[PDB]
Amino acid sequence: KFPRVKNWEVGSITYDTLSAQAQQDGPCTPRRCLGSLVFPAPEQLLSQARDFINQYYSSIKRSGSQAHEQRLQEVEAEVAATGTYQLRESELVFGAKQAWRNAPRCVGRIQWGKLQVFDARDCRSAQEMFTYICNHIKYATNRGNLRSAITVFPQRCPGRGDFRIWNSQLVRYAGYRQQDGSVRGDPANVEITELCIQHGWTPGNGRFDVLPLLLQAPDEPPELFLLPPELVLEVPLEHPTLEWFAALGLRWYALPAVSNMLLEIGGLEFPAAPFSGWYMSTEIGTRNLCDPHRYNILEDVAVCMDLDTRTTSSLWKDKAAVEINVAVLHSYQLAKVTIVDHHAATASFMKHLENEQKARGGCPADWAWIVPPISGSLTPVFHQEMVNYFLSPAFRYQPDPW
Amino acid sequence: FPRVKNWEVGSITYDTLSAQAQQDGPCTPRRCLGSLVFPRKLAPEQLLSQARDFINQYYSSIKRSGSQAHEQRLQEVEAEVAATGTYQLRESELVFGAKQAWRNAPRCVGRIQWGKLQVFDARDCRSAQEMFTYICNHIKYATNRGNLRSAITVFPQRCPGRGDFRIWNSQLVRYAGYRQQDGSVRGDPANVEITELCIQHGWTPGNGRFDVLPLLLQAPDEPPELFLLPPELVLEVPLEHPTLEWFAALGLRWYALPAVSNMLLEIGGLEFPAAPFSGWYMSTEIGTRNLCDPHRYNILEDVAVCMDLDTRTTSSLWKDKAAVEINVAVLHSYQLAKVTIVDHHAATASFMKHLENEQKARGGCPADWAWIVPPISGSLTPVFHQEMVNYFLSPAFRYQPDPW
Ligand code: HEM
Ligand code: HEM
Ligand SMILES: Cc1cc(N)nc2cc(CNCCc3ccc(C#N)cc3)ccc12
Ligand SMILES: Cc1cc(N)nc2cc(CNCCc3ccc(C#N)cc3)ccc12
Ligand SMILES: C[C@H](O)[C@H](O)[C@H]1CNc2nc(N)[nH]c(=O)c2N1
Ligand SMILES: C[C@H](O)[C@H](O)[C@H]1CNc2nc(N)[nH]c(=O)c2N1
Ligand SMILES: [Cl-]
Ligand SMILES: [Cl-]
Ligand SMILES: [Gd]
Ligand SMILES: [Gd]
Ligand SMILES: [Gd]
Ligand SMILES: [Zn+2]
Numbered sequence A: 001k002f003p004r005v006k007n008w009e010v011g012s013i014t015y016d017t018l019s020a021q022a023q024q025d026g027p028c029t030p031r032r033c034l035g036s037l038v039f040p041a042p043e044q045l046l047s048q049a050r051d052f053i054n055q056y057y058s059s060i061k062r063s064g065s066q067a068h069e070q071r072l073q074e075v076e077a078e079v080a081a082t083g084t085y086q087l088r089e090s091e092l093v094f095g096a097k098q099a100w101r102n103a104p105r106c107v108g109r110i111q112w113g114k115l116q117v118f119d120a121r122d123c124r125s126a127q128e129m130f131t132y133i134c135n136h137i138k139y140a141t142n143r144g145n146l147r148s149a150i151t152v153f154p155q156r157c158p159g160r161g162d163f164r165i166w167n168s169q170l171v172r173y174a175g176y177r178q179q180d181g182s183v184r185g186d187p188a189n190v191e192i193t194e195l196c197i198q199h200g201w202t203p204g205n206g207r208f209d210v211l212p213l214l215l216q217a218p219d220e221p222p223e224l225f226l227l228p229p230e231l232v233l234e235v236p237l238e239h240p241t242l243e244w245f246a247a248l249g250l251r252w253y254a255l256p257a258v259s260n261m262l263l264e265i266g267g268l269e270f271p272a273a274p275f276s277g278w279y280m281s282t283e284i285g286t287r288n289l290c291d292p293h294r295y296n297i298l299e300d301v302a303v304c305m306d307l308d309t310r311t312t313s314s315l316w317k318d319k320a321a322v323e324i325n326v327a328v329l330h331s332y333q334l335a336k337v338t339i340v341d342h343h344a345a346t347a348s349f350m351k352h353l354e355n356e357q358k359a360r361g362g363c364p365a366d367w368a369w370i371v372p373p374i375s376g377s378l379t380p381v382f383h384q385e386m387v388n389y390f391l392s393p394a395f396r397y398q399p400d401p402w
Numbered sequence B: 001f002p003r004v005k006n007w008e009v010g011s012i013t014y015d016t017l018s019a020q021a022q023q024d025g026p027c028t029p030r031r032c033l034g035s036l037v038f039p040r041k042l043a044p045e046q047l048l049s050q051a052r053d054f055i056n057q058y059y060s061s062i063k064r065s066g067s068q069a070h071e072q073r074l075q076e077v078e079a080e081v082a083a084t085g086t087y088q089l090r091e092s093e094l095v096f097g098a099k100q101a102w103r104n105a106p107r108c109v110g111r112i113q114w115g116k117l118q119v120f121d122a123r124d125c126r127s128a129q130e131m132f133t134y135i136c137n138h139i140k141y142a143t144n145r146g147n148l149r150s151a152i153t154v155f156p157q158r159c160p161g162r163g164d165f166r167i168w169n170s171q172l173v174r175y176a177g178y179r180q181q182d183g184s185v186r187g188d189p190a191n192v193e194i195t196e197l198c199i200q201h202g203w204t205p206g207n208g209r210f211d212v213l214p215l216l217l218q219a220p221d222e223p224p225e226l227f228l229l230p231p232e233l234v235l236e237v238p239l240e241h242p243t244l245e246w247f248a249a250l251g252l253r254w255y256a257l258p259a260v261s262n263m264l265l266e267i268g269g270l271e272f273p274a275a276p277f278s279g280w281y282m283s284t285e286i287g288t289r290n291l292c293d294p295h296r297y298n299i300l301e302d303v304a305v306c307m308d309l310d311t312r313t314t315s316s317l318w319k320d321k322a323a324v325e326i327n328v329a330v331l332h333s334y335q336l337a338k339v340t341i342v343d344h345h346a347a348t349a350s351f352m353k354h355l356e357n358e359q360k361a362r363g364g365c366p367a368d369w370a371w372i373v374p375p376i377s378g379s380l381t382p383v384f385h386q387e388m389v390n391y392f393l394s395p396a397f398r399y400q401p402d403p404w
Helices: A042-059 A067-082 A089-101 A126-144 A187-198 A281-290 A298-304 A316-334 A342-359 B016-020 B044-061 B070-074 B077-084 B091-103 B128-146 B189-199 B245-250 B283-292 B300-306 B318-336 B344-362
Strands: A004-006 A013-015 A116-119 A149-152 A175-177 A183-185 A213-216 A223-225 A234-236 A251-253 A262-265 A268-270 A394-396 B003-005 B012-014 B118-121 B151-154 B177-179 B185-187 B215-218 B225-227 B236-238 B253-255 B264-267 B270-272 B396-398
Touching: A042 A067, A042 A089, A089 A116, A089 A149, A089 A262, A089 A394, A116 A126, A126 A149, A126 A213, A126 A223, A175 A187, A183 A187, A187 A213, A234 A316, A251 A281, A281 A316, A298 A316, A316 B318, B044 B070, B044 B077, B044 B091, B091 B118, B091 B151, B091 B264, B091 B396, B118 B128, B128 B151, B128 B215, B128 B225, B177 B189, B185 B189, B189 B215, B236 B318, B245 B300, B253 B283, B283 B318, B300 B318
Parallel strands: A116 A149, B118 B151
Antiparallel strands: A004 A013, A175 A183, A213 A223, A234 A251, A262 A268, A262 A394, B003 B012, B177 B185, B215 B225, B236 B253, B264 B270, B264 B396
């Protein structure tokens, strides 16, 4: 009845019994699979909340006390009165952790227990928004020794608009279109760059200009805010033994902070709840720098390496890419900024799978996202079968507010 | 109809072909199991109906559907069925079917080739040594002195009342795996459980890392019989690196002909339990999976040491470095030996072109993303940033229980 999952490196077999409890449907059917797609009332708000409260009161081994049943009828009473309800502070910390724990595409989940939750549900303006954010960035960065954090702003509520952070991440580099059709800086951020400027931002000319923040308070236009230079820690990229590498002028920032996803807890929704951990070198080295549609330095690196770029069978792309990753890992360690390579990351993700099978009888994971974009079969996640499904609490995508 | 995006370019296609996908796979709205290797469950009724659309698919393909000619072929495949319970495919249909099953193979990255396939009609076969003769013509034709050629050999169709034709080795060419004192393995650990099945089915085992296995063949309802491939028929490539002179001394070799022989060919409701096929290798199958998988030959650490890399710390990416060179050595060796091979960039790029071809012809293409993406340098190849739909068409190659 439950899925038989197999590790093909070792020959071990589990059954994912946690799967039957999946709370929402994904894109797949018996006739076609769409796992590779990137993007797949009071009666109902209640049945989710009752489920969350049930969870929370179990993880503190207090299932069926009467803190538990008092808290249940408290919730439907308040939904009865006001149509919604407010999370307790402890419940919100639990729910935010759970959402991390539940994220199928995150290889970093061994850490899910150690999350710092900043409660900003009493935020009232965009100026105060900025302040909560700057404090988040300072705490999480910690002068290089990175810490996992999330800041939770006011939940969605009828009669008032949403808090929204327009930027996909707290730290991103401008992307200036040319008329060649060519882009200066990061091409993934052409759209946000044009928005910023239209909202009164004075742009730069570099390939690594840190973008301002577009912050939206309920029923207000977005307001621009310049992150202070000294708050955004960056790492100049150099190579341990290719000394011409540093002359490429490449840099990347320390903190990966996702700011545009929705946090869903017990039926309540938090359109603004930015979170951050630390980088895995492959995101910087392979995807951010080598993707043909991102910074695209691959051919340039390889030519400099005097590799033979006129044929594929010389494996120039793979040699260049491996060096680019080495440079990233070395640059971050030099600068004493936290970073994890794909081998250790997947390794620890395998200890997470074991922990999770003991605790909940399974773990949701999206194989195509867990497997590194280079060196897949060298990592132990490759040979591991996985079951992908949606548990709640969770982080969801959401439309761009413009 | 599923919206499929390419994220390197931004192009959008709709897979209208997935709508004809009538046998159901392992996934549901609630869970996804697309990473499972085996989605294994493993009367006249609709054998009829399985034959009628195959036949019609065939006549549409040679644009003579609904015409006259389409007449009689339809107008009693079913007497064959009425009278004897099954039907036989005329040779053109067996060629068509075979090519379609390849074309519909979701995990196969080389399908740009699907129209070039040699089909050998071994359906008149009846004895194990006749089978063994048909196999050796295959190898000989497919190997073709290193200028490899896609080939398949089709043995008789299963029917109740008699046993199956079944080749027992998983491939025609496979290296023995010998269980050790240590409970370790010498040779290929993948082939541990075929080796002893060969061993005292008579076979005198060899001593080596690379002893080519004997073929265990099975004619209907009889016990299997062993066969030694002649050495001259098994073409192999010694592995040397173009600059690291020490690499050759590691004494690695790999054979030239990938030839799978334990899958079941299904055409028009007829099942062919023994129907081996073969193309040529993509370099990563040898370089990365066969040679580097920890449960295969597991050589990655050895090459790192010889390259004088630091194996005390994963952050040196010594695994990554060693794997690239093993691969460069695979490609180099096969070229030097004038044996047909293809790198993973060349393959994947050709598979994007297959996709675009297939969009125009049939309005989509069943493709398993996890198996199409190469197991090194995935995001570096075009297929990585391409969304794919996986679904089961027919004709098709299927897995099947092992005949013991
Ligand atoms: C501490 C170190 C962490 C590491 C090394 C890590 C690693 C990763 C990686 C490599 C991805 C794939 C994203 C991509 O390739 O584009 C990912 C996705 C994801 N991670 Fe993490 N992560 C960390 C912390 C966190 C934290 C603190 C949270 C939540 C509070 C989180 C939640 C998620 C979510 C929701 C996704 C999917 C995002 C999406 O689908 O757009 N991770 N993670
Ligand atoms: C001629 C060039 C060919 C190339 C480059 C090629 C490449 C590949 C690769 C890389 C795989 C992945 C399997 C693995 O890595 O374990 C595969 C699987 C497969 N190929 Fe192709 N192949 C070729 C010829 C053929 C032919 C001639 C056929 C059929 C007549 C075929 C049908 C299949 C099927 C059915 C699978 C699935 C195997 C499985 O599910 O275990 N291929 N092929
Ligand atoms: C916490 C975290 C840590 C870390 N090291 N890396 C992390 C990477 C991400 C990456 N998520 C973005 C993935 C994406 C987003 C949008 C679109 C589109 N359109 C396509 C792909 C998220 C969170 C991370
Ligand atoms: C035609 C063909 C060509 C080619 N270049 N490579 C090809 C590779 C294959 C690989 N099929 C075997 C893969 C496998 C087999 C058994 C189990 C188990 N248990 C798990 C995985 C098949 C056909 C190929
Ligand atoms: C289409 C394709 O599946 C998509 O671009 C995915 C593949 N796997 C990924 N995996 C991770 N970790 N991050 C990604 O951005 C992607 N991109
Ligand atoms: C669990 C996972 O799906 C499994 O290990 C797969 C992944 N993709 C693969 N793809 C190919 N071509 N061959 C394989 O053996 C595998 N292994
Ligand atoms: Cl990023
Ligand atoms: Cl093989
Ligand atoms: Gd140097
Ligand atoms: Gd230059
Ligand atoms: Gd030496
Ligand atoms: Zn699926």
